[PDB]
C-alpha cells in the first residue's frame, strides 16, 4: 500500500522491540483496567468513582474546536525557503540576508468554501499558507492559488463568504446567492475568468502556484520603499483536473489533495515552488493605469518582469494533523523588519481579521502553540497572563513600559517607514472602477479557443441553476467584457433551460 | 424549481410592499454605509475610526463553533408527538396522560462519523434524536436507525469513535483503523451486520426506522417499574439507496437528506413515524436469556410484541439552520417523571456524556437557546449566574436551599424508583458475553440470500483495505458466526486481493 | 434594617399567598429531592445516574466569567435621561431631538484599579459608564468622575494598568511600580493631582462628578460638526471622605458604594445628575493653546462655559446584580448618528478595545444579552450565528449584501462627517508635550491652602514606599509644576524617612 | 524593606551587565517603538496598520480568566514531601516507598468565600491544597485548616456556597441568608464552632493546621484495604490573630498571609508541616458510634492516635504568581496506586467536581499547564486533539484501544479494591444524624472558659444582624448542644439588640 495507508503498521515497525507504554490518565496515574467501567455488580448502575471513564470521557467530550471560518478543509506540510538571489537592495528582511539562507519554513494547502470534511477536487479558490520562522519572528505569507480575490473592499468579504456557504434556511448551496453576488459585484469578473477556467480544480497541491496577491512594501537598510508582489510558481508544472475526473474523485477519495501531499512527501519525492517578486516604484505606482493597490489587478509581466529570489522546499509531513495543520495560525500581520503593509484595502483588513479569529478559534494564547511559536526568535514583552499560558509567564519581569529595571526596550532600527497621504478621510466608492479590461486581456490573450470554450462551458454550468434575471445580470457582466464571452455563456445557457 | 432552492425568492414574495429595514450595527445604531471603508484619502490606509467594519468583521470571525464530536452533519424538523393509545399503566409520564395529546416536538437526523459538509449518501448509522416539550420539562429520546450499538460499554465508546474518524497523523479515513477495531471486539458483530445490510444507507431520512435502543424503565402513578424499548417506525416505508446510486448522490448532492426532507415538508408531505413500545417484567429480565441491559442485544418480536402508543409528525421546517439545528442539544438526562434510566451501561455513560459536550459546545447556559429551553414548563432553581446569562437570572429569588422565604421547592412524588443491586462493586468483563446468536438469527432468518451476498459483497469491498492479519481476524469472527458468512467474506476478500 | 438587608424579607412579602414553584432541573423536570444524593445504601457511593446532583454541581462549576480587566468592582442603576434644553443646532442625535424627551439608561460606577471584592472607599479614579438606549441604538457614554486622565497615548495604557495593579511575582500591590511609571511619564502629573486631592475619595457614588473627558464630535442635520466635552455634575453636591474614615470603612463595609446606591434607590431619594456639554468650533481647536484631543487637558471654563443639556436620574435598582450590572457592556464606538469619534488618540483606542475584551469576557453575541440589547431599537444586518445566539438568528433573510431580495439596506443619511488630515503617517511623540500648566493652574488657583497641604501629605504618604531614585523624580517632576509643591512633598518625604 | 518589596530591583540586580532584551510582538518581530501610535499626522485618527498597538491591546483585554468559584484569592509555595516513616504496610503508594524519598509538592492556601482581591485576614474557613509530582502521576491532598465541614452531603454545596456570598440582588455579604441556612442545617453546628473559635483567623498560612478531612482508602501491595484520615501539623506553631488586629490589618494589608509566606520563604525560615495519618480497619469502621464516613465528624485521639509518615517543607516563592498559583488545578481524583476514595459522599461529589471547574475555569487541555503537568511521570494514553493543544498531541500514534500496533495497554496491577455494598439504590435521609455529640465535646473539654466566651461572643456579633426568628433557630440549635452555649450566645443577642 501508498505510505498514507501503513501509518500504523510503520509507527509499530519504527517502534519494535520496545514494550508498550503504560496506559495513565491525563494526571499520570496509571489505568488498571480501561475496558470495564466500575459498576453496582455485572449488571448494575455505573459509579462516579470512576475517574478513568469520566476522565477519558470529558477529553473526549472536549475534542473539538472551532473550524476556520474560511478555508476549513485543509493538508500541512514543512519544509525550508532557501534563498538563491540577491534582493538586499530592495528589503533589509533577515529571512533575506544572504546566499543560502535557509529558514524553516510551514505551508498549509486548503479550499476556500469547503467545510471540514467535504470534497477536495472542486472548483474553489485554494489557499497557500507560508509561515517563515525568521530570526525576526514569523513571517505569515498568507496567499492563494490566484493573483487576484473577487472583491477589492474588505467591508464586502464577510458577505460574499456567506453568499459562497450555506443558505441560512435549508442549509444547502445556493448558487442563486453566488450569481447573485458576482453580478451585483462586477469586480468579481476577472477572479471568476480564473475560477471556472482550467486551474479552477487544480490536480492536488503540488502542481499549482501560489501568489500572495497583495502589494507589500520592501524597505531597504538605507531606509528606501519599493512595492512588491510575491510570486511562487511550482517546479513540479502546472496540471489541472477534468471536470469528470474531480467529479469523480470527490466521491472515490474526498482526501485527494492531503493523501497526493503525504505520499508525495513520504516517497522522497519532495515538491518544490520557486520564489519571484514583481518589483515596482512609487513613481511607478503613481502612473500605473490602475490602481497598484487594487487586489483585482495584476501587474503585466512585460512592463515588471519576475525577479528570483528563492524556493519553496516541502520535505515533512505533519506528525499530528491537529497539532500541527489543525491549530497552525497565519496572521498577514506578521511581517519582519523590511516587509510593511500596503494602502491595498484588503490587506488592511486582513491585518485585523487574522488575529481576531485566532484568538476566537485558538485561545488568546494561541501563539504559545509549538506550530505557532516564533521557536527559531526571542519573545520578550509587557504582555502577561490570560487564558491557557503555558510559559514562564516571562517570569519576574516587570510588567509596565516604561520602567527603569532592565525590561525589554524598543528597538528604534525597527520603525515603519513613513509616507503621506492627502485627500479626505471618508469612505471612497471604488466599485465603478474598470472590471474589465484585464479580464479580456485574460480571454483574448491567455486563453486559446478550447480553453475558452471550456470556461464559458463551467460558468453556464454552474449558473444555470440560478433565476432569469440574476442569469441576464450576470451575462450582461460578461458581454461587457468581451461579447464573445457573454454570447457563448448566453448560448449555452438558453440550451440549458 | 423545489421550494428548498426558492428560499430568497419566497422570503422576498412574503415579505411584499415593505421597504427595506435600515441597515444596523449590532448594537442597533443605523449604518451610513457598509460597502466602502474609511482611507485616507482614495488610495490610503483604513482607519480604526470605522467601527461598523470592524464589528461585523469581529462577529464573522467569531461565527464558528465546535461541530459535534459525533453527528456533526445533521438535518433538523419540527412537529408534534400525538398519543394514540393509553400507557398510563406503564408509566405515568404527562406527555403520555389521555389520548389524543399533541406535545411539540424537535428531531435532528444526523450521521455518526461524518463532519461537518461531508457526504449525506454513505454507509453509517444514522442518529434520530427527538426533543418532547411536556409540560414536566423536556424528554430527550435519543435513538439511532438501528436497534443496537456496536459496543456494549461506554469506556470503549471514545476508542470507538477515534476507529470511526480520520487517522491522527494522515487525517484520512483508516479502513485499518475500523477494522483492527472491529476485529478485536467481537460484540460488534451484530450492528456491522446491520450497517453493511440494504439498510446501512437509507433513502433520505423520511425511509429510516427510529430506535431508541436503550432499555429504559417505566413507573406508573402506583410505584410498580418495568423495562421499556422504544421504537418508531416510518410510515413512509423503509427505503434504502443502492450502492451505486448512493455513491452518485455523494458527488451529485452531498445534502440529500436535508434537501429531501425540506422539499417533503414544503410540498405538504410531512412525513410521519409511529410510536411503539417493547414492555418486559422485572422477572423476565431475571430470566432473559441475555442481559437485556445488552445495547447489543434485541428483544424478540415474538416475546415481546410491539404495543402502539402515538405518532411522529415532522410539519414544520427550521427557520434557521443554525439557530435550531445546529444549536439544539439533546441530552438523554432529560427524562420527565415517569421515564428513568436502566443499568445499561451505554445509558448510564451517555447520561454523563452529553451535558458536558453541550457546556463545552454550546456554553454553559445552553437550556437558555430557545430550541433548547422547556417553554412549555416552568424552570425554577437555584441554578445562577454564568457565561452568557440571557434571562432574568431567576431575579432577587433566593439561591440557596433550604430556606425560609418560599423559595422553590422539591416535589416528592417525583422521587425516583429504588431498586435493590448484589454483587461487589468493580469492573466486571463483558466482552466474552454472547457475540453471534442473535447475529447468526439475523443472518438466516431474517435476510435472504441475495441480501446475504450483498452483505457479504460489501463488507468485502470495506474490508479489502485492511491488512492481511487483519482481514483474517474479522473473517475468523464472521465464520464464528456461520460459515456461510465468513466463507462467503473470505471467497471474495480472496477475489480482490 | 435598611431596604439593602431585608431583600430576602421582601422576597418573601411580595409573594405572599403564593404556593413555592416546583424545584427543576434546567431542562424543566421536576426535583424529586434535593437534599440527598443516590448512594449505594445507607453508606454506599454516588451514582452517576444522580442527574440533579450532577446538573446544578456543573452549573455551579460554571458561575464564574472572567472580571473586568479594570474597573472590576462596580455598583449599577438604571432610570432616564430627560432632556431640558434645545441643542439641536449642535446635534442630530435622536436622544436630543426635543425637550421632554426621555430614555431609558442604565449606569455602572467603578473603581479602575481594585478586583471583584475588594474596598469600595480607596483612593482610585471612579468611573461613570452610562448606557442611553436611543431609538438609534445604543450610546456608551463611558467617562470618569475627573475630567482628564492620567497618559494622553493609548498605547501606553496595559503598561499603566499593570503598574496599577499586583506585581508579577509576589502579586502584591507595589508603590515602587506605580511611582516608577508615573515618574517615568510626566504627562500624569495632572490627573495625580486629582487623584490625591480630596475628590480622590469620593463618599458614595452619589456625591462625585462624571465627565465623558474625550472629545467628542457633534454633528447637526445640515452637516456641520464642533468638538464637544460632555459634563455631568451631582444634584446631590460633591461630597469626599476623609483618609480616616475611608481606611475605617474598608474594613467595616467593603461594599459601601453600592450599599449607598441601593439604599438611596429604595428609600425614594432618586439621585440626579445635569448634564452639560463644553462647544469648541473647529478654528478655536486649531487656536487652542494647548491640544485640544489632549486627554490630560481640560478646556476652561471661562473661554468654554458650560451649555445645560439635561439630567440624569436613576429611579430603579438592578433585579439580579449579575444580569444587569456584572454583564452589561459599555462600547464607546456605540454613538448614535449625530455623535461622532474625535482625533483624541485615546478614544481611537478606546474605539477598538472595548468591544474586543466584551467578546472575550462576556462572549461574541453579548449583545443579545437583555441589559446590552438595543430594545429600544431595530437590529437588522447580515451579522449571523455565533457562539450562543439567543435569537431567531435574523430568521431566513439573505445573509449576504449586496443581494436583489429586499434585505436591510444602507441609510446614506448616516454617513460620518469628513476631514482633511494632513501630515506625514508615523508615530508622532507626545511625552514631550506641555505637563504643568493646567496642573499649576489647579494648584494655585482652585486649591485653598489646607487643600493643598492635605494634597501634598496623601501624595507623600502614598509615595513614601517607593526607592529613593523613583521619590527623587517624582518630587522632580512636582518641583517643576511648582516649586512649593514638590518643596512641601520632599519635606513630607524626608519626614517619613 | 522587606523582600517582597524589592523584587523589581532584585531582578534588576540579578540581571546586571546584561543589555536589555529586545522588544517583540507574540510573534517575535522587534517593535520599533511602543511608546506612540501611528495617525495621520501628529493630530490625526489612529490607523488599523499599527499591528504592535492593537496586538498588546487584545492581549490586555484577554488577561482575565474565570477567578475560582470558591478558594478565589490565595497564595502559593513550593517544596518538597519527605518520608520520614514506613507505611507501607498501609500503602503501596509510591509517594511512600521508602524512608527519606523527596517528591516535589505544590502548595496552595485560600479563603473559601473570599473574592479575588478580599482581605486576607478574615473569618474564614483555610484550604490548604497540596500537589505532590510522584513517578505515579500528581496527588491532590485538598484539604482544610479545618478536619471537618459544615455539610455533609454534596448536593447541599452550590446552596451552602451561594449562602456564604453575596446577596443575588443587592451584591452585598447578607448574615441573613449565612444563619438562615446554618440554622435549617444543624449538621453545620460543629464546623461553626471551629469557624467562630481562635483558629477562625490564623495568623498567616504558616501557623495553620493542615486536614485532609475526608476518610480515604489505604491499599497495600498484598490487596488489604483500611480506612485512612490525612493530618498535616504546622511546625511553627498554632498562633491566631485576634479580632481587632485582624480588622485592623484588613485595611492595612489585605495581602497579609501572601506577604508573610512570601517574606518567610524569602529570608530562609522554611515553613515546615509534619504529616501523619489516622488509620482504621473495616471491622472498626462498622462498629464505630458514627458514620466514619461522615465529613462532620473526627476520629478521636485517644481511640485512633496519630501515625508519623513524613513533613511537608516549602522552600521555593512562585516566579510568576498566575502562572503558577493562580492557575494550578487540584483534583482530587488524582490519587496514585494505593490510595483509593471512600464512601464518603462528599469525596464523590468532589471527585466530579474539580475537574469539570477546571476545563471550565482554565480549559479542556489544563492538564498541559507547567504547573499541572506531571512532569515526573509519563503520559501516555488515547485522549487526543482538544483547545489549545501545546504537546506533540502524542505523535502518530494509534487513538483507539484495544489495537494492535503496540500502543499504551493497561497496568493490571493498578486495578482498584473491591468491596461489596449492600442496601437498596435511594436516597438516604442524613439531616437527621447526630449533630450535637462531638461539638458538645469539643465545647467543654478542648476550650476553657474564655476561650467558650470569645467563641460566643464572635457567634454573636456576627448573628446579631440576622432578622430574629433566623436567631431564634441559630440559639435553639446551639442550646441543644449544650445549655451554657445557646444561654451565652441569647444574652449576648440580647444586648445588642
Ligand atoms: C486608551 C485608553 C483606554 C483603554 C484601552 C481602556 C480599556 C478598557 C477596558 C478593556 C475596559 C474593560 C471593559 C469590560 O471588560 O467590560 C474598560 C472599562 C472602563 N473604562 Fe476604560 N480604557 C481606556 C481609558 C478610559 C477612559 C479615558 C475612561 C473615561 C473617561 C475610561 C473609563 C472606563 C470605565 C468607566 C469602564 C467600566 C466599564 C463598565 O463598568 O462596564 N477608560 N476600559
Request: hydrophobic share 35%; aromatic share 12%.
Amino acid at each position: 500500500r501508498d505510505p498514507a495507508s501503513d501509518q500504523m503498521q510503520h509507527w509499530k515497525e519504527q517502534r519494535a522491540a520496545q514494550k508498550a507504554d503504560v496506559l495513565t490518565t491525563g494526571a499520570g496515574n496509571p489505568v488498571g483496567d480501561k475496558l470495564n467501567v466500575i459498576t453496582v455488580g455485572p449488571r448494575g448502575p455505573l459509579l462516579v468513582q470512576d475517574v478513568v471513564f469520566t476522565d477519558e470521557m470529558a477529553h473526549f467530550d472536549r475534542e473539538r474546536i472551532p473550524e476556520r471560518v474560511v478555508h476549513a478543509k485543509g493538508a500541512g506540510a514543512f519544509g525550508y525557503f532557501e534563498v538563491t538571489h540577491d534582493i538586499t537592495k530592495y528589503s533589509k528582511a533577515k529571512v533575506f540576508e544572504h546566499i543560502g539562507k535557509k529558514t524553516p519554513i510551514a505551508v498549509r494547502f486548503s479550499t476556500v468554501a469547503g467545510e471540514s470534511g467535504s470534497a477536495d477536487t472542486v472548483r474553489d479558490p485554494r489557499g497557500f499558507a507560508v509561515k517563515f520562522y525568521t530570526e525576526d519572528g514569523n513571517w505569515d505569507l498568507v496567499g492563494n492559488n490566484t493573483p487576484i480575490f473577487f472583491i477589492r473592499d474588505p467591508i464586502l468579504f464577510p458577505s460574499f463568504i456567506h453568499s459562497q456557504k450555506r443558505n441560512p434556511q435549508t442549509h444547502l448551496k445556493d448558487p442563486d446567492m453566488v450569481w447573485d453576488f458576482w453580478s451585483l459585484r462586477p469586480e468579481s469578473l476577472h477572479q471568476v475568468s480564473f475560477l471556472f477556467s482550467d486551474r479552477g480544480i487544480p490536480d492536488g497541491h503540488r502542481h499549482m502556484n501560489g501568489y500572495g496577491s497583495h502589494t507589500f512594501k520592501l524597505v531597504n537598510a538605507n531606509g528606501e520603499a519599493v512595492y512588491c508582489k510575491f510570486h511562487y510558481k511550482t517546479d513540479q508544472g502546472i496540471k489541472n483536473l477534468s471536470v469528470e475526473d474531480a467529479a469523480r474523485l470527490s466521491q472515490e477519495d474526498p482526501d485527494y489533495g492531503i493523501r497526493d501531499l503525504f505520499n508525495a512527501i513520504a516517497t522522497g519525492k519532495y515538491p518544490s515552488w520557486t520564489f519571484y517578486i514583481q518589483v515596482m516604484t512609487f513613481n511607478q505606482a503613481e502612473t500605473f493605469p490602475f490602481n497598484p493597490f487594487d487586489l483585482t489587478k495584476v501587474w503585466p509581466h512585460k512592463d515588471y518582469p519576475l525577479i528570483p529570489v528563492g524556493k519553496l522546499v516541502l520535505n515533512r509531513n505533519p506528525v499530528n494533523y491537529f497539532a500541527e495543520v489543525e491549530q497552525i495560525a497565519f496572521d498577514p500581520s506578521n511581517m519582519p523588519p523590511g516587509i510593511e503593509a500596503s494602502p491595498d484595502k484588503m490587506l488592511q483588513g486582513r491585518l485585523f481579521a487574522y488575529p481576531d479569529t485566532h484568538r476566537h478559534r485558538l485561545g488568546p494564547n494561541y501563539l504559545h502553540i509549538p506550530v505557532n511559536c516564533p521557536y527559531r526568535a526571542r519573545v520578550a514583552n509587557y504582555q502577561r497572563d490570560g487564558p491557557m499560558c503555558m510559559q514562564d509567564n516571562q517570569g519576574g519581569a516587570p510588567n509596565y513600559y516604561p520602567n527603569s529595571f532592565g525590561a525589554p526596550e524598543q528597538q528604534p532600527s525597527a520603525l515603519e517607514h513613513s509616507i503621506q497621504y492627502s485627500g479626505e478621510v471618508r469612505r471612497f466608492n471604488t466599485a465603478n472602477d474598470d472590471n474589465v479590461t484585464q479580464v479580456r486581456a485574460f480571454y483574448v490573450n491567455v486563453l486559446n479557443e478550447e480553453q475558452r470554450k471550456r470556461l464559458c462551458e463551467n460558468i453556464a454550468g454552474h449558473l444555470k441553476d440560478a433565476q432569469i434575471f440574476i442569469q441576464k445580470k450576470a451575462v450582461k457582466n460578461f458581454t461587457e467584457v468581451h461579447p464573445d464571452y457573454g454570447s457563448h455563456i448566453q448560448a449555452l445557457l438558453d440550451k440549458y433551460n
